[PDB]
Amino acid sequence: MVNWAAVVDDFYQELFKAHPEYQNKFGFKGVALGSLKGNAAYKTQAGKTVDYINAAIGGSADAAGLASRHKGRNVGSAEFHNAKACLAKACSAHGAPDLGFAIDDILSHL
Ligand code: HEM
């Protein structure tokens, strides 16, 4: 099956490399990017992100709910447009399908 866990790991490397300040909103704030895999808070976030991707593909994802929760952290359209770019890179590096359609669904509620 598609190694979405590896995709998500690359996605967060790309995201925080380009926008390090985004990391400050997480429980792994301040942690070196190259060490995130050994961080408990990151492990949980990465898993939830993978789950969301599998939910989007499976048809169960609550994009409105996810959008609302991100607004609840002051994360909106600008951030998700930036994320769309990083995720496209991560998917391409793994021969995985692009997830732009899934991010657009979230953007439609932001
Ligand atoms: C590909 C785009 C993204 C996906 C699929 C995604 C997915 C998720 C998911 C599934 C959760 C957990 C929601 C829950 O527990 O109900 C979450 C939480 C969160 N996301 Fe995102 N996210 C994305 C982009 C971003 C970006 C760009 C930021 C910028 C700061 C961000 C910030 C956060 C924060 C701060 C939380 C809460 C973390 C916590 O509870 O400690 N996300 N995200």
Curated annotation (Swiss-Prot):
Any one GO molecular function term? oxygen binding
Enumerate the UniProt keywords alphabetically: Heme, Iron, Metal-binding, Oxygen transport, Transport
Query: Quick check: keyword Transport in the entry?
Result: yes
Q: Where is the Globin domain?
A: 2-110
Output the InterPro entries linked to this UniProt entry.
Globin, Globin-like_sf, Globin/Proto, Mb-like_M
The UniProt annotation places heme binding at 70
Q: Determine the domain of life of the protein's source.
A: Eukaryota
Tell me the function of this protein: Acts as an oxygen store capable of sustaining neuronal activity in an anoxic environment for 5 to 30 minutes.
* Protein family membership: Belongs to the globin family.
Q: What do we know about how this protein assembles, alone or with others?
A: Homotetramer. Self-associates in the deoxy state. Seems to dissociate upon oxygenation.
Which protein is depicted?
Neural hemoglobin
